[PDB]
Symmetry: C3
Amino acid sequence: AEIYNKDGNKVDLYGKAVGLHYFSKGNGENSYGGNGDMTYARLGFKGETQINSDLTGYGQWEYNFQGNNSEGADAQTGNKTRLAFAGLKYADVGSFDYGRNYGVVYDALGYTDMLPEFGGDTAYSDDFFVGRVGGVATYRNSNFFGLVDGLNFAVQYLGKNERDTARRSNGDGVGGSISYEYEGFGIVGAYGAADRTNLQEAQPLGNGKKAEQWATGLKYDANNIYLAANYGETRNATPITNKFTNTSGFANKTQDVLLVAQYQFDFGLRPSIAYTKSKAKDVEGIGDVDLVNYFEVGATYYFNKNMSTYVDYIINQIDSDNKLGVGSDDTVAVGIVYQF
Amino acid sequence: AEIYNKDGNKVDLYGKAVGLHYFSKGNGENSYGGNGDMTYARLGFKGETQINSDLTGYGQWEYNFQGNNSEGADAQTGNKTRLAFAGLKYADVGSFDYGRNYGVVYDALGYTDMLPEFGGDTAYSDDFFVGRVGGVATYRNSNFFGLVDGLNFAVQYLGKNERDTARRSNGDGVGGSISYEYEGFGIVGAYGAADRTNLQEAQPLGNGKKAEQWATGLKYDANNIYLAANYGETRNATPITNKFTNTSGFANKTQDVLLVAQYQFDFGLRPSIAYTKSKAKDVEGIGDVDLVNYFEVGATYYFNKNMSTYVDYIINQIDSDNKLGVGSDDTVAVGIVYQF
Amino acid sequence: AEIYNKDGNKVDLYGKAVGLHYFSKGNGENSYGGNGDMTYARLGFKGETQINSDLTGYGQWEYNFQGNNSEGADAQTGNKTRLAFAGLKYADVGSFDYGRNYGVVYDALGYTDMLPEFGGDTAYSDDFFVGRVGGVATYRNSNFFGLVDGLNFAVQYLGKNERDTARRSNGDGVGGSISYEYEGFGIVGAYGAADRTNLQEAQPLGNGKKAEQWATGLKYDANNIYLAANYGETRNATPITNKFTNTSGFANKTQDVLLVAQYQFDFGLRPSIAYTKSKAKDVEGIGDVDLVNYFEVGATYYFNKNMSTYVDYIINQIDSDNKLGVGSDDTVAVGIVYQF
Ligand SMILES: [Rb+]
Ligand SMILES: [Rb+]
Ligand SMILES: [Rb+]
Ligand SMILES: [Rb+]
Ligand SMILES: [Rb+]
Ligand SMILES: [Rb+]
Ligand SMILES: [Rb+]
Ligand SMILES: [Rb+]
Ligand SMILES: [Rb+]
Ligand SMILES: [Rb+]
Ligand SMILES: [Rb+]
Ligand SMILES: [Rb+]
Ligand SMILES: [Rb+]
Ligand SMILES: [Rb+]
Ligand SMILES: [Rb+]
Ligand SMILES: [Rb+]
Ligand SMILES: [Rb+]
Ligand SMILES: [Rb+]
Ligand SMILES: [Rb+]
Ligand SMILES: [Rb+]
Ligand SMILES: [Rb+]
Ligand SMILES: [Rb+]
Ligand SMILES: [Rb+]
Ligand SMILES: [Rb+]
Ligand SMILES: [Rb+]
Ligand SMILES: [Rb+]
Ligand SMILES: [Rb+]
Ligand SMILES: [Rb+]
Ligand SMILES: [Rb+]
Ligand SMILES: [Rb+]
Ligand SMILES: [Rb+]
Ligand SMILES: [Rb+]
Ligand SMILES: [Rb+]
Ligand SMILES: [Rb+]
Ligand SMILES: [Rb+]
Ligand SMILES: [Rb+]
Ligand SMILES: [Rb+]
Ligand SMILES: [Rb+]
Ligand SMILES: [Rb+]
């Protein structure tokens, strides 16, 4: 909610309380998302300052607070900064910003990431360009310098983040995304290539010095109808873990298919029908294995713009044969959300 | 403080800075609350949205920030999310909410929890129903569906939270609290029963598959006078630690007595006289031992609704003989508080 | 930004998003500040309540959120509470506050701490009186009880903070700072003495039961010109680490020299020219070694009061001979900042 607007500067302090619970077979040990309490709260701000007639400065921060944790020693599990960036926009020239932000491949993967709780599994956090990453300088353009309306292109420069784990580590890289929108329809083509750290190559799973991520996207967003389709492939980028041998690393090749179909009713009901298939290739000692495979059936109910309730059910298509050890059981998520 | 109120939605961002210090014999090693710096700050929001004529949606989050910590490695000690929940209320039918919230036994124990700093020791955090817990769905009713004014009943459903420590672990359970208020007077009767996890049974202290918590409460809150009385008993629920054998677990039986007497002066002075007795029974290898035993003498001074200063002194009645090893020395707490 | 002002109470919720990056030789292993991503975000509040005609209550909290971290296990590195205090001011008598706050020696060292990114190395955090510390009760006076305008004196009482590390540990102590300001000019003389904990004496580096910190300061702050000069000496107080023997402790004697020269242009440009020399003496097994030695050349550009960009370059004067093992390579920092 916008809480400040005075002398050429506006502040929008936003947040949400999500009373979330997961339902699965067993103790959520071998399911799609686990079971039990998954309550979380959000807090952050969106800032914008009118510098002059056609130049604006901005700054955004977002944090994830967890409510499913105790007040004891485990009081800080899953607590992280999601967004933290500042930048400038100069009319019909472009926008530049530095700080923790979504990658440029998410410009294509954000098409199918509209499900009540789950969906968009390929948009991993701290994974080069598919999700929220550090060391990123993003240039974004709207309407091609104010010449061709709808045509939007973006370029990003990923910096090296040598961390304790190879899962969260990355090298230097450049990404891009081209998009055009015309009367409901929208087509996106994103690509991102980056170097891999020495710790990433040291892992038992995954072999290669270079990491590549690309995704395409077609959608229709007009008259209460949302239909989305994503197809993408990653090279030495998708984070994978073997539950049998207790080994971590990356998948050499993945085919990622996302399909989403939603309708928004006038009385405030959004049923959601989706499909997700993500299969890996050339896994060390394994070969070809399905990482993510399911059908999504859900429904979201908005009371207004502030209060909402949703039930998100996933029909897990992953077999018990899975050579890596991915959860095969179904996961039902019911959540009540207040937001401001 | 309420910072937003527009189109059927209001946001109340609240918080406080508590400049707190503890005084005790030694290095607070063997006292009621320890000694030294205990400065802490709070931050959170209270939200409410007017959905229609007689339906309201809400969402609340609360966090505890610690100021008595360094900026080094110990920069996150005692930092936790206290509240994180969202829910709906529909006029004279009831109110339902899910997310981290106080248990239903606190509806009775909150009667005597009005002391400047200490008091309400039996209202432990992450302990089934006596305090703030996870996995709770609470239904609350006011004026018995709008028929019998003053009569308030509530039901809660505690979910299983299998954690790293048995202290913070709990199973599935159901709780309840019945209350009636009439011209200053108020009588409460709360009860809560829940299952115990395998880690809780594995502890050297405490034996039993079921955990029970019940408490009664009588008070008078009229014309600047606050008199409160609590009596409760727990079954395999009260968290206890043996300082001699270095063992943790739960007490099989506890008798909990709370007495509070306060007056609010017109010039802004609230003296506080209280008594607390909590004795354990059937402790493994010990038997009967006093957990909490003291007299409280304190005073709170409100400058206004925002600024306050208080001195809270506890006369510890616990002997040095204590077979478990509970602190016997007195603890004096002086704190200066700003709140908004 | 001030977001609340009603019935004798005002709340100022402030924060900033700093898109910061560091440039150095190698992997920032042997430089002045390191290299890579250093993005951070801030959040806090400034409160003030009008109690009566000439008495005001206040409360301030400040937190540092890090954006250069992952969402995984390292999601809470460098996250700390910087400020957390509440206090009272009574017209021309003085101001008293308790809670985490800057030390009284920073009243002199804050003179040269005006550089775009770096500078003020002698103002260490959790170090007795030079920076932000715990267990501090500060009395501050303005215009000498309203008699001699410009003359400001302050007294502080540091409490003992026995922590896990000797670096962040301190004992009981008293500090003071006397200052006078007259038409741009300002002269400050600060002093602070405190006891050392048993863990601080147990360290291989540093020998002495008492810790002393004093600093002087001359400045000119008038007509877009800022010229500052600091000189100070510490006794068993300055935290030092030997990179060769892997030992930590304190320096017995340090000579601290700070020089700053800045001009503020009318179109919004602030070039910064600074000098810093901090040499240690009587180091255990070493003797005399330079801790901090460099020239600062930088520039800050304010678009307005909310948006800013700066480039801060340090010319590291420290040799590779350094017997302790302090970074010798240069560090270039470029940052884009939004604030509200
Ligand atoms: Rb189930
Ligand atoms: Rb686990
Ligand atoms: Rb611990
Ligand atoms: Rb821990
Ligand atoms: Rb988003
Ligand atoms: Rb949705
Ligand atoms: Rb970044
Ligand atoms: Rb970087
Ligand atoms: Rb490999
Ligand atoms: Rb909906
Ligand atoms: Rb498979
Ligand atoms: Rb709606
Ligand atoms: Rb299945
Ligand atoms: Rb004492
Ligand atoms: Rb301890
Ligand atoms: Rb550390
Ligand atoms: Rb730690
Ligand atoms: Rb309360
Ligand atoms: Rb009180
Ligand atoms: Rb919960
Ligand atoms: Rb649960
Ligand atoms: Rb037992
Ligand atoms: Rb009072
Ligand atoms: Rb006893
Ligand atoms: Rb009052
Ligand atoms: Rb005693
Ligand atoms: Rb460089
Ligand atoms: Rb390091
Ligand atoms: Rb971990
Ligand atoms: Rb960790
Ligand atoms: Rb400052
Ligand atoms: Rb500056
Ligand atoms: Rb303090
Ligand atoms: Rb202290
Ligand atoms: Rb020593
Ligand atoms: Rb400037
Ligand atoms: Rb040297
Ligand atoms: Rb300016
Ligand atoms: Rb050099």
